[PDB]
Design an enzyme around this catalytic site. Structure first.
Site, PDB file in Angstrom:
ATOM      1  N   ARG A 241      -9.160   0.599  23.213  1.00  0.00           N
ATOM      2  CA  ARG A 241      -8.677   1.724  22.402  1.00  0.00           C
ATOM      3  C   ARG A 241      -8.482   1.285  20.961  1.00  0.00           C
ATOM      4  O   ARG A 241      -8.442   2.097  20.029  1.00  0.00           O
ATOM      5  CB  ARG A 241      -7.374   2.304  22.986  1.00  0.00           C
ATOM      6  N   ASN A 242      -8.328  -0.020  20.791  1.00  0.00           N
ATOM      7  CA  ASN A 242      -8.167  -0.595  19.483  1.00  0.00           C
ATOM      8  C   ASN A 242      -9.421  -1.203  18.912  1.00  0.00           C
ATOM      9  O   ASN A 242      -9.393  -1.792  17.851  1.00  0.00           O
ATOM     10  CB  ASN A 242      -7.007  -1.586  19.488  1.00  0.00           C
TER      11      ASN A 242
ATOM     12  N   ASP B  23      -6.270  -2.635  14.797  1.00  0.00           N
ATOM     13  CA  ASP B  23      -4.986  -2.362  15.371  1.00  0.00           C
ATOM     14  C   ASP B  23      -4.508  -1.086  14.707  1.00  0.00           C
ATOM     15  O   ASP B  23      -4.109  -1.102  13.550  1.00  0.00           O
ATOM     16  CB  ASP B  23      -4.019  -3.516  15.105  1.00  0.00           C
TER      17      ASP B  23
ATOM     18  N   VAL C 167      -4.821   8.772   9.835  1.00  0.00           N
ATOM     19  CA  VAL C 167      -6.064   8.112   9.492  1.00  0.00           C
ATOM     20  C   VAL C 167      -7.129   9.197   9.323  1.00  0.00           C
ATOM     21  O   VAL C 167      -7.413   9.962  10.252  1.00  0.00           O
ATOM     22  CB  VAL C 167      -6.486   7.085  10.577  1.00  0.00           C
TER      23      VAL C 167
ATOM     24  N   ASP D  13      -1.882  -6.294  20.898  1.00  0.00           N
ATOM     25  CA  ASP D  13      -2.279  -5.025  21.523  1.00  0.00           C
ATOM     26  C   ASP D  13      -3.818  -4.879  21.690  1.00  0.00           C
ATOM     27  O   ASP D  13      -4.394  -3.842  21.355  1.00  0.00           O
ATOM     28  CB  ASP D  13      -1.640  -3.830  20.771  1.00  0.00           C
TER      29      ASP D  13
HETATM   30  C1  LIG Z   1      -5.225  -8.215  13.340  1.00  0.00           C
HETATM   31  C2  LIG Z   1      -6.142  -7.137  12.798  1.00  0.00           C
HETATM   32  C3  LIG Z   1      -6.965  -6.634  13.979  1.00  0.00           C
HETATM   33  C4  LIG Z   1      -7.043  -7.753  11.732  1.00  0.00           C
HETATM   34  C5  LIG Z   1      -5.366  -5.978  12.208  1.00  0.00           C
HETATM   35  C6  LIG Z   1      -5.972  -4.787  11.790  1.00  0.00           C
HETATM   36  C7  LIG Z   1      -4.905  -3.994  11.356  1.00  0.00           C
HETATM   37  N1  LIG Z   1      -4.831  -2.776  10.801  1.00  0.00           N
HETATM   38  C8  LIG Z   1      -5.828  -1.898  10.949  1.00  0.00           C
HETATM   39  O1  LIG Z   1      -6.814  -2.173  11.634  1.00  0.00           O
HETATM   40  N2  LIG Z   1      -5.696  -0.697  10.357  1.00  0.00           N
HETATM   41  C9  LIG Z   1      -6.630   0.307  10.376  1.00  0.00           C
HETATM   42  C10 LIG Z   1      -7.440   0.634  11.463  1.00  0.00           C
HETATM   43  C11 LIG Z   1      -8.364   1.673  11.322  1.00  0.00           C
HETATM   44  C12 LIG Z   1      -8.508   2.397  10.126  1.00  0.00           C
HETATM   45  C13 LIG Z   1      -7.708   2.082   9.032  1.00  0.00           C
HETATM   46 CL1  LIG Z   1      -7.847   3.010   7.472  1.00  0.00          CL
HETATM   47  C14 LIG Z   1      -6.801   1.043   9.206  1.00  0.00           C
HETATM   48 CL2  LIG Z   1      -5.768   0.565   7.874  1.00  0.00          CL
HETATM   49  N3  LIG Z   1      -3.788  -4.727  11.495  1.00  0.00           N
HETATM   50  C15 LIG Z   1      -2.525  -4.392  11.220  1.00  0.00           C
HETATM   51  C16 LIG Z   1      -1.724  -5.252  10.470  1.00  0.00           C
HETATM   52  C17 LIG Z   1      -0.402  -4.977  10.214  1.00  0.00           C
HETATM   53  C18 LIG Z   1       0.175  -3.818  10.686  1.00  0.00           C
HETATM   54  C19 LIG Z   1      -0.564  -2.934  11.447  1.00  0.00           C
HETATM   55  C20 LIG Z   1      -1.893  -3.236  11.697  1.00  0.00           C
HETATM   56  C21 LIG Z   1      -0.011  -1.637  12.012  1.00  0.00           C
HETATM   57  C22 LIG Z   1       1.368  -1.284  11.457  1.00  0.00           C
HETATM   58  C23 LIG Z   1       2.197  -0.466  12.426  1.00  0.00           C
HETATM   59  O2  LIG Z   1       3.210  -1.044  12.866  1.00  0.00           O
HETATM   60  O3  LIG Z   1       1.905   0.709  12.775  1.00  0.00           O
HETATM   61  N4  LIG Z   1       2.099  -2.510  11.194  1.00  0.00           N
HETATM   62  C24 LIG Z   1       1.617  -3.574  10.338  1.00  0.00           C
HETATM   63  N5  LIG Z   1      -4.019  -5.994  12.050  1.00  0.00           N
END
Ligand SMILES: CC(C)(C)c1cc(NC(=O)Nc2cccc(Cl)c2Cl)n(-c2ccc3c(c2)C[C@@H](C(=O)O)NC3)n1
Length: 270
Positions: free
Chosen positions: A141-142, A155, A30, A137
């Protein structure tokens, strides 16, 4: 728009200028970026190799297109044509909430700011519940802090990125044990009500300025203790009604825990 096939999320890689990786490295691939034509700082998650890790990336992006709330991380666009693939979101300038709490001036981040941060999270979780999305999760931290104590729930897939005792084995499976509902520990199944458990621990996190939960207790010891009805004590200066909310989120039976809609109502009504 004229395009027949069309994707409103897809956009031009060369719009973004990629800076160094975020959180040093312990948050994965990231990056800090600038979307120059908007003078906007962004957070960019990339995918290298040809790989068939590609499937997950595309799951993540498909989830994020659905989610639209001021207290949830918001998708700004993607790049899926050619490597690397990009997920692009707004940069939350103060980083993750755990470190924010630990490293902050408590006069500026006083008790009303803590309670305002908690209400933002409860509202995010209310939306997710309404959508029937289980987070799985939830933890400081999230969560991410932006301008003027804006909090967004994200997440980062931290179970595959954090080293140390945060994520550990319990009965042959991996859990962030300290945030994990007893029924999730025992039966490895999850629910909105298990997120409610996580929410109560996150509350305790906020209330202590980012202390590690269950101080004085050995991790191998938490399940047995929870079963004997041990819960964390009220933190110093924590509002009575906030602690009672914690204690409600930590009811043994998931059905005795409040909904997030109810949790938000407790904040409105307190
Ligand atoms: C529920 C909600 C809180 C809206 C959420 C937010 C994210 N994702 C995200 O918050 N991502 C992100 C965070 C900070 C900066 C960026 Cl650039 C991003 Cl893209 N997910 C998300 C969805 C699907 C997956 C993951 C994360 C992580 C990934 C993994 O198994 O590792 N598997 C599939 N669900």
């Amino acid at each position: 728009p004229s395009s027949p096939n069309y994707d409103k999320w897809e956009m031009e890689r060369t719009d973004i200028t990629m800076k160094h990786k975020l959180g040093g490295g312990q948050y994965g691939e990231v990056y800090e970026g600038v979307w120059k034509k908007y003078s906007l700082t962004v957070a960019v998650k990339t995918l290298k190799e040809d790989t068939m890790e590609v499937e997950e990336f595309l799951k993540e992006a498909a989830v994020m297109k659905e989610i639209k709330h001021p207290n949830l991380v918001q998708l700004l666009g993607v790049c899926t044509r050619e490597p690397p693939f990009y997920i692009i979101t707004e940069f939350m300038t103060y980083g993750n909430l755990l470190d924010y709490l630990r490293e902050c001036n408590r006069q500026e981040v006083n008790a009303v700011v803590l309670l305002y941060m908690a209400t933002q999270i409860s509202s995010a979780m209310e939306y997710l519940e309404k959508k029937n999305f289980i987070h799985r999760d939830l933890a400081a931290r999230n969560c991410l802090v932006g301008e003027n104590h804006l909090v967004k729930v994200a997440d980062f897939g931290l179970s595959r990125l954090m080293t140390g005792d945060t994520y550990t084995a319990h009965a042959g499976a991996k859990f962030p044990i300290k945030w994990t509902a007893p029924e999730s520990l025992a039966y490895n199944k999850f629910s909105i009500k298990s997120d409610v458990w996580a929410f109560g621990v996150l509350l305790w996190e906020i209330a202590t300025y980012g202390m590690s939960p269950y101080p004085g207790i050995d991790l191998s010891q938490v399940y047995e203790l929870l079963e004997k009805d041990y819960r964390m004590e009220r933190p110093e200066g924590c509002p009575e009604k906030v602690y009672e909310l914690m204690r409600a989120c930590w009811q043994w039976n998931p059905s005795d825990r409040p909904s997030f809609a109810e949790i938000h109502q407790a904040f409105e009504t307190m």
